[PDB]
Design a protein around this motif. Structure first.
Motif, mmCIF file in Angstrom:
data_model
loop_
_atom_site.group_PDB
_atom_site.id
_atom_site.type_symbol
_atom_site.label_atom_id
_atom_site.label_comp_id
_atom_site.label_asym_id
_atom_site.label_seq_id
_atom_site.Cartn_x
_atom_site.Cartn_y
_atom_site.Cartn_z
ATOM 1 N N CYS A 28 0.827 -1.198 0.000
ATOM 2 C CA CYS A 28 0.000 0.000 0.000
ATOM 3 C C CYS A 28 0.866 1.253 0.000
ATOM 4 N N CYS A 33 -4.742 1.358 -1.329
ATOM 5 C CA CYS A 33 -4.712 0.253 -0.387
ATOM 6 C C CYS A 33 -4.876 -1.038 -1.164
ATOM 7 N N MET A 34 -3.921 -1.947 -0.984
ATOM 8 C CA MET A 34 -3.879 -3.231 -1.672
ATOM 9 C C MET A 34 -4.120 -4.392 -0.712
ATOM 10 N N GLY A 35 -4.776 -4.108 0.417
ATOM 11 C CA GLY A 35 -5.092 -5.103 1.424
ATOM 12 C C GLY A 35 -5.985 -6.243 0.980
HETATM 13 ZN ZN LIG Z 1 -3.921 -0.888 2.913
#
Ligand SMILES: [Zn+2]
Ligand code: HEM
Ligand SMILES: Cc1cc(N)nc(-c2cc(Cl)cc(CN(C)C)c2)c1
Ligand SMILES: C[C@H](O)[C@H](O)[C@H]1CNc2nc(N)[nH]c(=O)c2N1
Length: 415
Positions: A28, A33-35
């Protein structure tokens, strides 16, 4: 610089400072956000000697600060000793205690693992003297037997020699030690586990004679010191299986389903003090939903929501009858019941998520935090009737750590 996480079911607030010791990056940024990316470019794993001593020093500082002898003479002599060996060898070797500590803390730091309350009761099997695929098989067989423990499962990890050059890597080509085969059919459909259809063909490519059925335990593909891998069959008496029945529905046995007792991930990479263990099979016990929700009901796995709903006689014409949800709960009642009536260790998604909150409390108290990946911690059914749904979680990456790594057959220079 001292972040707070709230539980919105209990109004409980916890203060995280542990994230300050974090080193790796998350994927991220301030503006994305790449969660929910599954295998972010970061979570995947080549080292030089210059990079190695900071990593070694960092790790040795944790370990000595752990045994309450931080910065003393035995520490400084071990710092110099490893420093010197990284001059001599451009690498180094962990003490047995340093190995046990690193392995236990790789688990402790696994932020997608809901079972970490047990992180300190882990049995470390040092296989760093292994040299051959047959040796690996023997070590792996002793792991299965010890960890299975007649149904009273025990946490364990077997650690094969560390990477050196890169082309002499020990690898277990299976994604788990025990998995069922998947065979595509001459009409497109799939028998057994669709996840393993490629791997099943790689085993037949290397000589496996397949019984071509449903729940065929796969052979082990073991690669030793970078050599080509070799097929080995786990003695069936070591593979403990649970036939799945229901406590109300007597037709449920005629479904003919079964699952193996021992979940044992073998495709990941253990990182300790900058050293890379390419083969490190680790095992615990199942949370029920892994089997009854994901294995049994993922559209691209066994996909039994169809057949269970039929036998229940359900309104399968309308999406909004929730016939899928309804068949999903029974299926997981049966997995739990079957494993429990056989004295095979298993944990329900309610008990495991409560223990994680308890675990989270201990980590914020006696450690200052607990990295946790909400996307993965929340069970794949009944989300909000479990306490982890209502619990904010900070995700950050600490070492020692388990990491993903490419499949050996996309990288192995064959012969
Ligand atoms: Zn994130
Ligand atoms: C003790 C019983 C254990 C339980 C109940 C448990 C439970 C789980 C579950 C449900 C997942 C999610 C997997 C999925 O849904 O696809 C997971 C992930 C994981 N577990 Fe645990 N586990 C246990 C033991 C262990 C042990 C012994 C280790 C290592 C020594 C470990 C390390 C991990 C790792 C590395 C992941 C993947 C996390 C990631 O991708 O960062 N677990 N666990
Ligand atoms: C030691 C251990 C215990 C447990 N209870 N689970 C796991 C697990 C991990 C991953 Cl990474 C994936 C899976 C199963 N998926 C293929 C559905 C299970 C590992
Ligand atoms: C898209 C998403 O990141 C992916 O499906 C994740 C979601 N959360 C998960 N959570 C667990 N425990 N296991 C999984 O395989 C996944 N898959």
């Amino acid at each position: 610089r001292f972040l707070k996480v709230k539980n919105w079911e209990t109004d409980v607030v916890l203060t995280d400072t542990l994230h300050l010791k974090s080193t790796l990056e998350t994927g991220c940024t301030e503006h994305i956000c790449m969660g929910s990316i599954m295998l972010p470019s970061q979570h995947t794993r080549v080292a030089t000697k210059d990079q190695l001593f900071p990593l070694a020093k960092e790790f040795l500082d944790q370990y000595y600060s752990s045994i309450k002898r931080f910065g003393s003479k035995a520490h400084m002599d071990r710092l110099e000793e490893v420093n010197k060996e990284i001059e001599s060898t451009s690498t180094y070797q962990l003490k047995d205690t340093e190995l046990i500590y690193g392995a236990k803390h790789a688990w402790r730091n696994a932020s997608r693992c809901v079972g970490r309350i047990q992180w300190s009761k882990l049995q470390v099997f040092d296989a760093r003297d292994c040299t051959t695929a047959h040796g690996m098989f023997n070590y792996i067989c002793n792991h299965v037997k010890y960890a299975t423990n007649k149904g009273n499962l025990r946490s364990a990890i077997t650690i094969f020699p560390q990477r050196t050059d890169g082309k002499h890597d020990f690898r277990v080509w299976n994604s788990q030690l025990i998995r069922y085969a998947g065979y595509k059919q001459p009409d497109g459909s799939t028998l057994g586990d669709p996840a393993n259809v490629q791997f099943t063909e790689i085993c037949i490519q290397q000589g496996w004679k397949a019984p071509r059925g449903r729940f065929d335990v796969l052979p082990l593909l073991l690669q030793a010191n970078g050599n080509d891998p070799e097929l080995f069959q786990i003695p069936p008496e070591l593979v403990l299986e649970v036939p799945i029945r229901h406590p109300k529905f007597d037709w449920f046995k005629d479904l003919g389903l079964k699952w193996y007792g021992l979940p044992a991930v073998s495709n990941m990479l253990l990182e300790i003090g900058g050293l890379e263990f390419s083969a490190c099979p680790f095992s615990g016990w199942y949370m029920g939903t892994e089997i009854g929700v994901r294995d049994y009901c993922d559209n691209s796995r066994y996909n039994i929501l169809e057949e269970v709903a039929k036998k229940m006689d359900l309104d399968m014409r309308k999406t909004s009858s929730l016939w899928k949800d309804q068949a999903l709960v029974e299926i997981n009642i049966a997995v739990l019941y079957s494993f429990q009536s056989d004295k095979v260790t298993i944990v329900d998604h309610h008990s495991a998520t409560e223990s994680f909150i308890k675990h989270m409390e201990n980590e914020y108290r006696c450690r200052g935090g607990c990295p946790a990946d909400w996307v993965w911690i929340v069970p794949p059914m009944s989300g909000s009737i479990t306490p982890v749904f209502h619990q904010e979680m900070l995700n950050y990456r600490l070492t020692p750590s388990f990491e993903y790594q490419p499949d050996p057959w996309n990288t192995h220079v064959w012969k």
